Design a protein around this ligand. Sequence first.
Ligand SMILES: *[C@@H]1O[C@H](CO)[C@@H](O[C@@H]2O[C@H](CO)[C@@H](O[C@@H]3O[C@H](CO)[C@@H](O)[C@H](O)[C@H]3NC(C)=O)[C@H](O)[C@H]2NC(C)=O)[C@H](O)[C@H]1NC(C)=O
Ligand SMILES: *[C@@H]1O[C@H](CO)[C@@H](O[C@@H]2O[C@H](CO)[C@@H](O)[C@H](O)[C@H]2NC(C)=O)[C@H](O)[C@H]1NC(C)=O
Ligand SMILES: *[C@@H]1O[C@H](CO)[C@@H](O[C@@H]2O[C@H](CO)[C@@H](O)[C@H](O)[C@H]2NC(C)=O)[C@H](O)[C@H]1NC(C)=O
Ligand SMILES: *[C@@H]1O[C@H](CO)[C@@H](O[C@@H]2O[C@H](CO)[C@@H](O)[C@H](O)[C@H]2NC(C)=O)[C@H](O)[C@H]1NC(C)=O
Ligand SMILES: *[C@@H]1O[C@H](CO)[C@@H](O)[C@H](O)[C@H]1NC(C)=O
Ligand SMILES: [Ca+2]
Length: 964
Amino acid sequence: PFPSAVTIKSWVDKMQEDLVTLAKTASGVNQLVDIYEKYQDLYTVEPNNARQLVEIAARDIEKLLSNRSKALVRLALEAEKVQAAHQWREDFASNEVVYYNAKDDLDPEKEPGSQRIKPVFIEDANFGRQISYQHAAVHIPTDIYEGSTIVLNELNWTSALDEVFKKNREEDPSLLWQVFGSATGLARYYPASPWVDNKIDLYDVRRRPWYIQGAASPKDMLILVDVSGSVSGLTLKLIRTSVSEMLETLSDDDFVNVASFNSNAQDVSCFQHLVQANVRNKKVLKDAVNNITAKGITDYKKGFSFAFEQLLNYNVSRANCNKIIMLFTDGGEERAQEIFNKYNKDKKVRVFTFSVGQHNYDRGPIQWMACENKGYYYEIPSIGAIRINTQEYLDVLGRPMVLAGDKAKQVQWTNVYLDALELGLVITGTLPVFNITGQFENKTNLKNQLILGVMGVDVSLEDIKRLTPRFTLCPNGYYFAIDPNGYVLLHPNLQPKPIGVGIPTINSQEPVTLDFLDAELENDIKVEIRNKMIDGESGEKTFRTLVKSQDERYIDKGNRTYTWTPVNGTDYSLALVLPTYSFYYIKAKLEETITQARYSETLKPDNFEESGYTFIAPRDYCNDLKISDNNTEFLLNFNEFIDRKTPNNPSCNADLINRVLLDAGFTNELVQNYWSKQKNIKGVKARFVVTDGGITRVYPKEAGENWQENPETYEDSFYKRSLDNDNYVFTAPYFNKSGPGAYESGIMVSKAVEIYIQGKLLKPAVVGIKIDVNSWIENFTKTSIRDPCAGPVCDCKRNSDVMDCVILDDGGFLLMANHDDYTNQIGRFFGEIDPSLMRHLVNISVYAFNKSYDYQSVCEPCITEQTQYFFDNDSKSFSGVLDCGNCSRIFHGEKLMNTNLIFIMVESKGTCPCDTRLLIQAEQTSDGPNPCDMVKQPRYRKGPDVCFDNNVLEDYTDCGGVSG
Ligand SMILES: *[C@@H]1O[C@H](CO)[C@@H](O[C@@H]2O[C@H](CO)[C@@H](O[C@@H]3O[C@H](CO)[C@@H](O)[C@H](O)[C@H]3NC(C)=O)[C@H](O)[C@H]2NC(C)=O)[C@H](O)[C@H]1NC(C)=O
Ligand SMILES: *[C@@H]1O[C@H](CO)[C@@H](O[C@@H]2O[C@H](CO)[C@@H](O)[C@H](O)[C@H]2NC(C)=O)[C@H](O)[C@H]1NC(C)=O
Ligand SMILES: *[C@@H]1O[C@H](CO)[C@@H](O[C@@H]2O[C@H](CO)[C@@H](O)[C@H](O)[C@H]2NC(C)=O)[C@H](O)[C@H]1NC(C)=O
Ligand SMILES: *[C@@H]1O[C@H](CO)[C@@H](O[C@@H]2O[C@H](CO)[C@@H](O)[C@H](O)[C@H]2NC(C)=O)[C@H](O)[C@H]1NC(C)=O
Ligand SMILES: *[C@@H]1O[C@H](CO)[C@@H](O)[C@H](O)[C@H]1NC(C)=O
Ligand SMILES: [Ca+2]
């Protein structure tokens, strides 16, 4: 029969007592506590003033960005002057311009006016590529010829930029790239490196996001696509491709909507008013455009009366400047003067008309439409012209800002994106270069209304991470930065991968934009904090929050303090996250050389046998010291650097080395004093200790090989979980993996060491014990059953036909069970085993499911969706019958004290046959939030407030029709 409540309570208490006493008397929690207090005077406890740390880091970031901006300013000034001094030569001798071309074979062994350079590249670990500091490299795309009179002249006058490149690199030796995009297509970057290796190069500097950002202002684009009968065939395909390519030239500050009209206008997609050009809204628009079919009779007066009306909707968020209309058609007869005179008579909306396809229609009304209203006229007769014709409109948009003068020259930083030359995540500062030919004397201003190009300097996210040190903080603490759009400049979750836009269809260029709410669990307080950081305010917030574990299988509850201050002079805002225990940290004392030598003796490779297999985190301690992926090489390197020259050396971080050696001494003292006394423990497979300061030691040698955790202590998930929890934490092993299962490695349970210096609280180290599966299962079996209770089993035997005994963790994964096949399935989620039982537990509020979306994830032909189950009711007791289909199974669940395990004893599914749709806990490729519903309630984003959208001097006489 079903055991009584007092009997099962006693049974759970016995199992608890056994496990907790084994863990406490095997891993020396009190032992390390006593060691830490009684080895005082070798360290001091220093405060962590968040208001000071975040301000210092913000000031450092501001200084770095000002350094990066001064180079742009001086480069732009020099380029403007050199263009002002240039003479337009036409007769170029075969050797008059000298450059590298950055795309020629280095060994040709062999032009109209150019002489190539054979440069020398040695190496540079700062870039990873092979670079030359002697001269700059020029990239000319495949389409544009390098012998044209328009390209040779720039190849000549831009040659003066190399001196300023060298001057900037010698003033600030940390400059990565210094690129000068040109209006003709060529790009000049200072460190001479070969271009990226069918290998055809489609790169065009005039389409990169930084160039587009620096060449114009945020736009309000409304593409108007003609879908009448006449555009059927090749014209429709060209229109679709051209619209997609035009959508590709849009940033997050830009708002766009695509409409269509044969005889009555309609929105092409679910959007109705306007959407910002994210990576997802753009995909929605592209798919809706690719679904377009052509049928009907053209009606311009009903399409423009629709475009102008959606350009007047102010209930929604928009860039509120540069209201432009794109007309994609073939040709017609109606110019529709009445519509323009009615809607746009003061001429505040630009109109760009495109004549797509190969035909013989009247290209007359559309040229007049692009002429009367501000705009330019384009013709796309083939796929080749699509790129240039779609990218050219920025030249037209750039006139107001150049006419503004030396007021639009403001440095703007792009979103995080993967570098073209493979440096990883970078951000580029952009400064436009104006045309000042004949500036001193008021003679020429007709062609001075077009930009020469955009200057750009790249700063890597590694620099910004280096400006924010994290090793004085607890692993749970971290830094993050937010831009006005809400995306993260810095975040631990952010990874160098393109953002998943949707489910991968069967059979790097895009910016990496990850929102703050999409990098952590969304919470009500975290939205207010995000809004405050966007507004640019400084404040403190302490609140209870749910934090996802690093392994992403668990959710644990902790106290966190958010401190944020704006990076003044820059749109970005910086914030610091600190748990309560992280407010105080241990700083190692200088001590003496004898102590350093004694501590260095501990972790030598020959000393593994006594100390245990030692892991050292790959943290850079010296500039010459090189971190390695394999921990053995790094440990050998650290040993030889410490022993060979000095424990403390110039150009090395004294604090980090002192902390590491102090931790090594503490760990060796622990092991030799306590662990060595008990050579073998029946319940314990292995004893390991993980300590802040990047050292990990496990006593058994076989366990060291079995140990699969990250060498870095901060990256360990179990370490962070033990920090968050004040009780013993059990970590479920991985199931059906290449790594050894929980039969040779055991079950990992970890308890955090708590230190009380003065009244302060410190949690420097975490200890763990690996539990033998065999000892655990036999102990679980013997205590559960009562020998004289009854003939039929009152509790589970080794293989109970009826009664089922399984103990679960907070995540719900199975750690121990009576059944043999269940024990073969240790480490698996308890779903796929008794899914109806899990659904009942969730329904009665035993576990709480919280789902999220990972956007930077890779699948097999993407956004995935993850689920993470946690305990949510702190009631130690739950019972009930399952009320199964036509039946009912009785269960009782008791949680095992501190250890956090939960034992549930229920009947087998033979008794009451329920349905088994599994409750899966993995990540399943799932498309993310519907964009259509998310645009109705947008998030809060601050927007640039500097727009140059009109000047009255602007000469709109270059409309294009006349010049063709
Ligand atoms: C655009 O191309 C032109 C051709 O290379 C360059 O103009 C030439 O610059 C040369 C620099 O070596 C000048 O040579 C020197 O000029 C001085 C006058 O200061 C004279 O004594 C000599 O002609 C000569 N001597 C020296 C000191 O080497 C050429 O006079 C000059 N003229 C030509 C041939 O066009 C420009 O440099 C280039 N533009 C930019 C901005 O780089
Ligand atoms: C950035 O500079 C601003 C200047 O506006 C600083 O803000 C000032 O802070 C000082 C003392 O902290 C006060 O005397 C001023 O009244 C503040 N001005 C305000 C309210 O804007 C700010 O300290 C700097 N921020 C950083 C990151 O150091
Ligand atoms: C939203 O925009 C629409 C048009 O874009 C406008 O509709 C008005 O709605 C209010 C109340 O909802 C009513 O007075 C009328 O239906 C509309 N006003 C007019 C045309 O007189 C309005 O600008 C916005 N609606 C709201 C919610 O204010
Ligand atoms: C994720 O977990 C949190 C904490 O359990 C959820 O918040 C609770 O939701 C339940 C109902 O699901 C309410 O009864 C509680 O009052 C909520 N607590 C708080 C503090 O709001 C949260 O709703 C879960 N879901 C997601 C996906 O966010
Ligand atoms: C700014 O550059 C100066 C030299 O130009 C340098 O001393 C300083 O460290 C730089 N600031 C940074 C990189 O934060
Ligand atoms: Ca037609």
